[PDB]
């Protein structure tokens, strides 16, 4: 049993909810929240900008030190950093950004990072300002992630479309 509430069950391991990932993290304090990161961990907008704002910029300060030491992530890659006030840990995962011309086949590699964690609160990778089709992102998620993932979708119109169209 876990703390996650109000989710619709899509499969054995994937759950979905119309929820504000920031507000959900603040309520649950999950072991792992996933960030929709870029390779530079520049948390300007989208999910990343919202998560970072909720940490009062502490996520960005930590991230800048990580990049100064290790250099940029790979598209499809990840790193584990602090969850600050939102979670124990933040798994920063880089999905391909279609608005930069990145290979959508890298979305499966991105979701494979989730399998290193037994339970996660996450957004749909490469959705929103990363430009991918969220219906596709949900299909790759279901077909790739084997650990227990709780997906948060802020916009009701998209949430309702994801559920209604789910095979």
Ligand X SMILES: Cc1ccc(S(N)(=O)=O)cc1
Q: Which residues bind ligand X (CB under 6 A)?
A: 21, 46-47, 50, 128, 154-155
Q: Between residues 69 and 157, which has the closer beta carbon with respect to ligand X?
A: 157
Least distance (Å) between residue 28 CB and ligand X? 15
Q: Between residues 69 and 97, which has the closer beta carbon with respect to ligand X?
A: 97
What residues does 28 pair with on adjacent strands?
Answer: none
Q: Between residues 65 and 135, which has the closer beta carbon with respect to ligand X?
A: 135
Which of 67, 81, 75 lies closest to 35, judged by CA? 81
Q: Between residues 16 and 21, which has the closer beta carbon with respect to ligand X?
A: 21
* Tokens 């950093």 -> residue: 81
Task: Give the span between the Cα atoms of 43 and 133, in whole angstroms.
Answer: 21
Residue nearest ligand X (C-beta atom): 50
Least distance (Å) between residue 121 CB and ligand X? 12
Which of 89, 79, 70 lies closest to 38, judged by CA? 79
What length is written for the chain? 167
């Amino acid at each position: 049993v876990n703390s996650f509430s109000g989710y619709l069950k899509l499969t054995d391991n994937v759950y979905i909810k119309n929820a504000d990932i920031v507000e959900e993290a603040k309520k649950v304090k999950p072991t792992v929240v996933v960030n929709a990161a870029n390779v530079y961990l520049k948390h300007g907008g989208g999910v990343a900008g919202a998560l970072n704002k909720a940490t009062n910029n502490a996520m960005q300060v930590e991230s800048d030190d990580y990049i100064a030491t290790n250099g940029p992530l790979k598209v499809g890659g990840s790193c584990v950093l602090s969850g600050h006030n939102l979670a124990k840990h933040c798994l920063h995962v880089v999905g391909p950004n279609v608005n930069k011309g990145e290979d959508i086949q890298l979305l499966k590699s991105a979701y494979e990072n989730f399998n290193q964690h037994e339970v996660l609160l996450a957004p749909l990778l490469s959705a929103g300002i990363f430009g991918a089709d969220p219906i596709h992102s949900l299909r790759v998620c279901v077909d790739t992630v084997r650990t227990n993932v709780y997906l948060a979708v802020f916009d009701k119109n998209l949430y309702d479309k994801l559920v209604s169209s789910f095979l």
